Amino acid sequence: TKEDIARKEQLKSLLPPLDNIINLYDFEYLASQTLTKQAWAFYSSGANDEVTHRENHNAYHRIFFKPKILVDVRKVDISTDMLGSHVDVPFYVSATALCKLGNPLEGEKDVARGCGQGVTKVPQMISTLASCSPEEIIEAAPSDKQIQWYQLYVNSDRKITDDLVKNVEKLGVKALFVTVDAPSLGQREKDMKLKFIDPSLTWKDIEELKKKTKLPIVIKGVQRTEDVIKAAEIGVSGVVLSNHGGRQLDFSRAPIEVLAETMPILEQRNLKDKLEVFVDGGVRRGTDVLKALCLGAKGVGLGRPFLYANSCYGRNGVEKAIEILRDEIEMSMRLLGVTSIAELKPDLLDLSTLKARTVGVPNDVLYNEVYEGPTLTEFEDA
Amino acid sequence: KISPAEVAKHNKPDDCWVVINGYVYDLTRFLPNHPGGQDVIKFNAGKDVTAIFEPLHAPNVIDKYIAPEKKLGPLQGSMPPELVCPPYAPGETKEDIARKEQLKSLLPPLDNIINLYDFEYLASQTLTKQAWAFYSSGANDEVTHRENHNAYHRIFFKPKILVDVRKVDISTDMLGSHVDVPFYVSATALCKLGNPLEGEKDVARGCGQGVTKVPQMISTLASCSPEEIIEAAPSDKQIQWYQLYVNSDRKITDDLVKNVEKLGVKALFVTVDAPSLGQREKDMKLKALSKFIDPSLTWKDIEELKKKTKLPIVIKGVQRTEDVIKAAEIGVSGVVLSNHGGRQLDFSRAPIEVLAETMPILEQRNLKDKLEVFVDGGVRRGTDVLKALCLGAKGVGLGRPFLYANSCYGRNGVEKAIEILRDEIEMSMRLLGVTSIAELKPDLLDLSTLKARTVGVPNDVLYNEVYEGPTLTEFEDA
Amino acid sequence: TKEDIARKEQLKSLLPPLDNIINLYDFEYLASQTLTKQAWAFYSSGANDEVTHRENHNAYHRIFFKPKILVDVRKVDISTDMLGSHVDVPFYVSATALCKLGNPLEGEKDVARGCGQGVTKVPQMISTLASCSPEEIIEAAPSDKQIQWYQLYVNSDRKITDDLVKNVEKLGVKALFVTVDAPSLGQREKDMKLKFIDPSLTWKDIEELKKKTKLPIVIKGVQRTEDVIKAAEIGVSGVVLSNHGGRQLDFSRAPIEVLAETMPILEQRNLKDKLEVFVDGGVRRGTDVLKALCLGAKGVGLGRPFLYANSCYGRNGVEKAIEILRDEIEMSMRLLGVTSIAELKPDLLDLSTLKARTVGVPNDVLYNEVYEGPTLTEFEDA
Amino acid sequence: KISPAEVAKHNKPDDCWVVINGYVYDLTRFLPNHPGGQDVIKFNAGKDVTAIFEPLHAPNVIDKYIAPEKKLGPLQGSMPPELVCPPYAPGETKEDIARKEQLKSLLPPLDNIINLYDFEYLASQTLTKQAWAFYSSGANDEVTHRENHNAYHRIFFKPKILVDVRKVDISTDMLGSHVDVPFYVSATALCKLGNPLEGEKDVARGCGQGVTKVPQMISTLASCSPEEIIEAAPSDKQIQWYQLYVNSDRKITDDLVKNVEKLGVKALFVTVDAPSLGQREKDMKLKALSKFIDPSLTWKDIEELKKKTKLPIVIKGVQRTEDVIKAAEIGVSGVVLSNHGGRQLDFSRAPIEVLAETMPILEQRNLKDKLEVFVDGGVRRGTDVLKALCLGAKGVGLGRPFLYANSCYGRNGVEKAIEILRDEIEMSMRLLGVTSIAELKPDLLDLSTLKARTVGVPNDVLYNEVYEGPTLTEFEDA
Ligand code: HEM
Ligand code: HEM
Ligand SMILES: Cc1cc2nc3c(=O)[nH]c(=O)nc-3n(C[C@@H](O)[C@H](O)[C@@H](O)COP(=O)(O)O)c2cc1C
Ligand SMILES: Cc1cc2nc3c(=O)[nH]c(=O)nc-3n(C[C@@H](O)[C@H](O)[C@@H](O)COP(=O)(O)O)c2cc1C
Ligand SMILES: Cc1cc2nc3c(=O)[nH]c(=O)nc-3n(C[C@@H](O)[C@H](O)[C@@H](O)COP(=O)(O)O)c2cc1C
Numbered sequence A, C: 001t002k003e004d005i006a007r008k009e010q011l012k013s014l015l016p017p018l019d020n021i022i023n024l025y026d027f028e029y030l031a032s033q034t035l036t037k038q039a040w041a042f043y044s045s046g047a048n049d050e051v052t053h054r055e056n057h058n059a060y061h062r063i064f065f066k067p068k069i070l071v072d073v074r075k076v077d078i079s080t081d082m083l084g085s086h087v088d089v090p091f092y093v094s095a096t097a098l099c100k101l102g103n104p105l106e107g108e109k110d111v112a113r114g115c116g117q118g119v120t121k122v123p124q125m126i127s128t129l130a131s132c133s134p135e136e137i138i139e140a141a142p143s144d145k146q147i148q149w150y151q152l153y154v155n156s157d158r159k160i161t162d163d164l165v166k167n168v169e170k171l172g173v174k175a176l177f178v179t180v181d182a183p184s185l186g187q188r189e190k191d192m193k194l195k196f197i198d199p200s201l202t203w204k205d206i207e208e209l210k211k212k213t214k215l216p217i218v219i220k221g222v223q224r225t226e227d228v229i230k231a232a233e234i235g236v237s238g239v240v241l242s243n244h245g246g247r248q249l250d251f252s253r254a255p256i257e258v259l260a261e262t263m264p265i266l267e268q269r270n271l272k273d274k275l276e277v278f279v280d281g282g283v284r285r286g287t288d289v290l291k292a293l294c295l296g297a298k299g300v301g302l303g304r305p306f307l308y309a310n311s312c313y314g315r316n317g318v319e320k321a322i323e324i325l326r327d328e329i330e331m332s333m334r335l336l337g338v339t340s341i342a343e344l345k346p347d348l349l350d351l352s353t354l355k356a357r358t359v360g361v362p363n364d365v366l367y368n369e370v371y372e373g374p375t376l377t378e379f380e381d382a
Numbered sequence B, D: 001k002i003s004p005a006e007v008a009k010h011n012k013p014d015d016c017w018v019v020i021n022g023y024v025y026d027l028t029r030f031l032p033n034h035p036g037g038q039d040v041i042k043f044n045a046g047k048d049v050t051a052i053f054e055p056l057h058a059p060n061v062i063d064k065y066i067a068p069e070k071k072l073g074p075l076q077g078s079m080p081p082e083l084v085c086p087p088y089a090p091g092e093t094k095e096d097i098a099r100k101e102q103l104k105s106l107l108p109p110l111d112n113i114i115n116l117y118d119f120e121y122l123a124s125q126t127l128t129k130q131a132w133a134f135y136s137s138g139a140n141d142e143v144t145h146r147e148n149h150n151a152y153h154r155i156f157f158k159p160k161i162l163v164d165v166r167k168v169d170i171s172t173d174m175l176g177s178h179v180d181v182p183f184y185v186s187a188t189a190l191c192k193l194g195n196p197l198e199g200e201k202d203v204a205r206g207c208g209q210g211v212t213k214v215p216q217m218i219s220t221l222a223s224c225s226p227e228e229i230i231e232a233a234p235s236d237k238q239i240q241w242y243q244l245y246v247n248s249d250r251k252i253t254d255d256l257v258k259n260v261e262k263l264g265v266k267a268l269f270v271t272v273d274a275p276s277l278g279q280r281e282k283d284m285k286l287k288a289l290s291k292f293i294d295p296s297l298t299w300k301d302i303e304e305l306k307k308k309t310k311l312p313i314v315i316k317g318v319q320r321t322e323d324v325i326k327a328a329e330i331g332v333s334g335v336v337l338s339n340h341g342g343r344q345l346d347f348s349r350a351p352i353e354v355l356a357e358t359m360p361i362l363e364q365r366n367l368k369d370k371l372e373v374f375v376d377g378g379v380r381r382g383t384d385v386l387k388a389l390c391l392g393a394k395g396v397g398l399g400r401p402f403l404y405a406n407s408c409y410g411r412n413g414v415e416k417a418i419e420i421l422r423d424e425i426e427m428s429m430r431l432l433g434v435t436s437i438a439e440l441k442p443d444l445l446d447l448s449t450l451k452a453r454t455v456g457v458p459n460d461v462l463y464n465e466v467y468e469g470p471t472l473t474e475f476e477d478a
């Protein structure tokens, strides 16, 4: 659309020094003024009205902290074990589809490199609909030590998928994330305005996929305790509490709000140790990851921040986003008065207004238009 | 014949005469009982007021309401130059051209309309100010109107996963007629304000021309006779419903029910929520009792109507559980939990909030399967309809989306609205993990914050006046 | 300040035809663009931050209606008895101080005339600090039939007041409204920015004022049930639930919210029939008067609407404001399904979110700045 | 002597040297432990950095923290032209004149300041961007800062009537010293950013020159020595409090406590809420551990401090009831429920919400009269202070109002702030129907919606995008 001018004059060296990005929102602001409408639209969307999409984040704001003081905090350790391996930080790059729209040059291989090129390794989750082959992506990885996972959309032509599982196990991915919340892919109206998955998956299809592989299986997209408990009764390793970035059903509850309610049940039913619950959608700050780890999640995930850090600063941007959030989680822990992930339990949290999810009554337009309130002191004109 | 100035002469309130299309009518007695207030007749009495009347009235009305001894004989040709009215668009200007070039196919091609909100947006722009005032207003500083929709956002979902949601069936049965889709079009007065050539005939056509066909409730203050609307239905399989206000002259209503049964409308939605007209200030800004909508109608009156008719009787306008229980107790077919689009009493509650209150009580008192509860007001997105049906409503209705669709794009706009919303419902039913309307049960809903209807404390203009936010990182130039 | 130009060119016949004022807010909009800063400031104020001032109104929005249908409503009757006399409508003109600032010419005599010149009589409450003498005002009244009340600020020089009571009883006022909430007159900062009452009143001082007059006495300014019940134990006729227009203490509760809570107590203690509770502040609509009458108030009052209808349209404006609100109460009653004031009881009301008085958590400025949501369809440019 | 380029030479991180006012110091070891992060030293090491240092430091600091073997001898006259620093105002421009003419008595004359918010407004305008960034920021997208104040608006009043509120007495006793007013000034770092000539000396003067005199808490990162602040107190009857961070070199803190006891400060407020510095992005945008504020300090450490000192010990920074109970259990004089002005951990709760939680529990566990709870953060209006005292807090404190008052108007600005707020408290106590701080009890408060801290559902941009409001009546012209 001839903005390409605007965009490469923004993008070519008006972009701030990577050293000057203070938070994950800065990468989103930058991606928005430069990516193609085509890509911003496909990346930034939600399923219409996008209230679950914003709600996933804002639900982290109904939960406040109850910090400990005079606790030694010189030394704090954020590493945890997620799904067999022991990883460095508690968060992971989650599975964006098509990473090439904003990073045409290297796509999802640049996330692989960003997730192992620096001091910290952050798990990578690869999309069945990645725009680079599994082989490519895994082979881009800088370490033996960085860990990768594979999210599988199963196909209606089951043999396609069936080969794919045995092909990625071979390629060494470290678990399978079946994404089960996308029978049809939600109405991302921002896309439409500018314009693979089977519909039949069912618990038995997971049961057989258990029998057919060695990799740990996690149902990605669970959205009510009754499926977390099925995910347990059929034996998968994990369950990722998710509503797909608020891009599938729109009045879907926020993930942290389901966690707060599904973990006590998994203690009353004792199957808590049997099951790794992860959580994603809306995390944008170290304190959102800490509200999620204090409530029970094994690890928490992030799609979009990584996606726009990559599309703006490629591998180096995905490395920096990892340092940024790792610093937030680290400093806020000093401040919570805790030293190890296992020390984060729920009593570090005020959950009394978790359910203060309010819709207000219509603004009194006329009382408000005619009303006018205090003014502050004026200067002299002279 | 009869002569001009001797007619014009009668240029008064109270003793008022008027010319409408060649005949002269004494409109004295009629003036204070006119449905939209007497002022409109009043400001143009003594004149040839045809301009206002002929494009805006269910044709049959003079011969149907004006008693013949007030039907005076022919006016000799014409009322002199400024005694023939300009068309009714109070407050317009030459504007009707900027709005007509706005309209002139500059209207996005129908395949780009993505939701019911686009038809609003479009219609505010291209509509004539009286019509937009009429169609969009609410009674009285408008909090039950906005509330009607915002109350659905007080409800969330609990979708189930790994359920094979491959074929999805959204048909349902309303009021003993299997219908293709769980929603209907509500009754709306004057569709000719926005769609002047066909008015209510094009919604009759839009509902029944596609593959999905949807039930049409026809209003008693419709611009077209029911005769035409039914006649213009494009498919013998589509359904039409009649919405009655009972007249103070009850033999008139008695004659309206036997006539629309013969024409074959399938059910009678009697509107009880409008005894006095709601005050709609945006319309007033632009310019309450009446005998037409009898204000002494009571429960005994509906009991008598049942005897007089074989069609089902649905009381539209109910606002508390007690009036659901009483209407179940007099044995009427169904109740429409509605507050008229929020143009009648203004801090009236949201019908979904009342639905939620009511349906447990209709199960406890074991009356639930003997009364079909419909809901309207504020529905705009298929998840709204799904919230209304997981809570028990048999069918959901829409008033304004269909007038903005119909006004902008006519019959294909009504079809495209039917399409847009059926798709939103099927889509959301898959993602919700269910496949039949019968599978839509409350256990799929989050109701824990159903009642969090807040008014927050007025706040603090100088604290915010001086507060500065955080900021993003700027490009080196901009 | 030379705006006097602006103002008399606004005021002289740009003002809309009195026939074109649709509601009480219209008079406030008009008064605001024309009155002197001096007067708008003294009329429109609140005690700083003005949160009780707005809260008095908005608290009417936590209460919704539960209307009755198929109830005969051809004929509805809004008259009630307030304080011995039987008055026409349930609301009254309440006691503004100095009515001459916006209506320099006739001041509070024009309200007297507006409250009896038309079909309806509305009680008048005269200010001890009126800017016209009692004598003047009472003698301006158009009817034998309109009723007037006197609100007394007692003075520190008690004989001044003492003469005044016996002087107004003589002049025929129909009750005494002691205003007891203004020991010192609150900080109306809007005034200050442009710039009589004793402090010692006490229940015993009311006790003696009982003994010293025949007129019914109403303590105007009560603000918690424990003083409504004292007002009952010492024997005054009424209690006006009020916080003085939200111009005295600022985080004061809203009047309707105290009523909702003090009336059930007056039924548990049975002293309900013994005491006329009135309510004022924020009423601006017929449905606010109906929410107040459904909860128990004998009658409800309005200061500012009358004050700006007078200052804009003098006696005729006070007459019109009375017709406007009388039509609102009348039509909304048809619509509630009731016919007489005594028929308004509380069960016509949903009080379930009366206490949904919320303060929100701080807007996430960055998530909100970078976020952008759906757009509606565009037209063609060509 | 010692020579220039051989000094300049040392223009590196890690092995870093610097000139400050004639002497040369090896600032290698010191760089990574500097209180406001090492970058500021780093970006100007090897240079004559005096410009930055001399107007911004508690004079005594080099000789007090820089170990003498790093205190190198005299630099020969001068560091060459661009080796002598411009003053620290990162991000300014020539601006310092538009802001100085803004300041130039165009500042409204003090009798027109009506509330503490006017001093903010004024100070945002006239302050140097580093200072405004420093003084106004919060840690981290700022919701515990705004919350701190908005939480008072979750509390209302229940005033009693017909009580003779003629003489009102607002004095109270804090920490065994009868004080004229129930509030104090909190500790603030660098008052010389905003008030460069006197900094913390003018608040020492403003608090003690009027008739009302108010307790001054002096910060350990103050721009002035405590020696001067105390010295510049204008009235022997005013009170001064010392706020300590304990150093990792604990003999240093040991020497700070015996020195400020000799000077006569009345109590030690030990700040435990800042082990790691809070991230303050507005300040970063404009440009965490350190040994200075030892991050291993624990309850045993305070227990040892008690032995070492005779002054009362108040732990400032507590954030839950459990740390109130433990500090009551080790027997420390009081606790300040504070979260550092909301520049430290960001979704930390509002101290009034914690006060409300805590005080019932300090009565149940019968410890209430043996621990004085102060509260700060977010207090701006005398009703705020009254809410804090009806709930049990002994005294309330303010950080920012006093820096914006002091920066704009100096010592008379601090007096006028003391005056403005004492008047708001006396006024509101009359209208509240009470006359002594002791009469301020909880039964005067509405706490029913204390916990209604809501986050509402994200809403609905296209419904609102197309919604039109009602309107007022316009003048015939405008
Ligand atoms: C001869 C007797 C008449 C009959 C039987 C008749 C009947 C009605 C009916 C049943 C309706 C619909 C009300 C609504 O929109 O809510 C209506 C509306 C209306 N009528 Fe008549 N009418 C009569 C005469 C007139 C005349 C003489 C005029 C010309 C001044 C007129 C102008 C209108 C208009 C313009 C409206 C709609 C008001 C608006 O703009 O919103 N009518 N009438
Ligand atoms: C010689 C050793 C030094 C000592 C003992 C010392 C001590 C301190 C202390 C205790 C504070 C207050 C921190 C705060 O505002 O939170 C401080 C702040 C600061 N120091 Fe130093 N300092 C030293 C050297 C320097 C030098 C060489 C410079 C020049 C680059 C400097 C520049 C500053 C500045 C400008 C701040 C405040 C940062 C801001 O703008 O917000 N200091 N220093
Ligand atoms: C651009 C985009 C594309 C995505 N494509 C997929 C995909 O290929 N597979 C999958 O399971 N999830 C997909 N996700 C969603 C998950 O990786 C995940 O839910 C994540 O985006 C969580 O939301 P957040 O970005 O709000 O944290 C995609 C998300 C985005 C925003
Ligand atoms: C322009 C307009 C006129 C209406 N006229 C009638 C009518 O003739 N009869 C009736 O019973 N209700 C009427 N309705 C309201 C209802 O059919 C209906 O409940 C509907 O408007 C619901 O509200 P919604 O428009 O928000 O969906 C009218 C609504 C509109 C907006
Ligand atoms: C301009 C103004 C002056 C007032 N002066 C007095 C007065 O003289 N005496 C009194 O008791 N009340 C006074 N009131 C308040 C009462 O008459 C009454 O509380 C009323 O204003 C209620 O508030 P409303 O205007 O919000 O309904 C005054 C109110 C206003 C707004």
Ligand SMILES: Cc1cc2nc3c(=O)[nH]c(=O)nc-3n(C[C@@H](O)[C@H](O)[C@@H](O)COP(=O)(O)O)c2cc1C
Binding pocket: D134, D135, D136, D148, D186, D187, D188, D189, D219, D220, D221, D222, D243, D271, D316, D338, D339, D340, D341, D342, D376, D377, D378, D379, D397, D398, D399, D400, D401
């Ligand atoms: C500029 C600034 C620096 C501060 N420095 C300190 C400090 O040196 N020591 C300390 O214990 N707290 C410090 N505080 C915070 C507290 O004294 C105090 O709790 C106060 O700021 C309360 O918040 P308020 O400013 O919202 O009233 C500082 C606050 C500000 C705003």
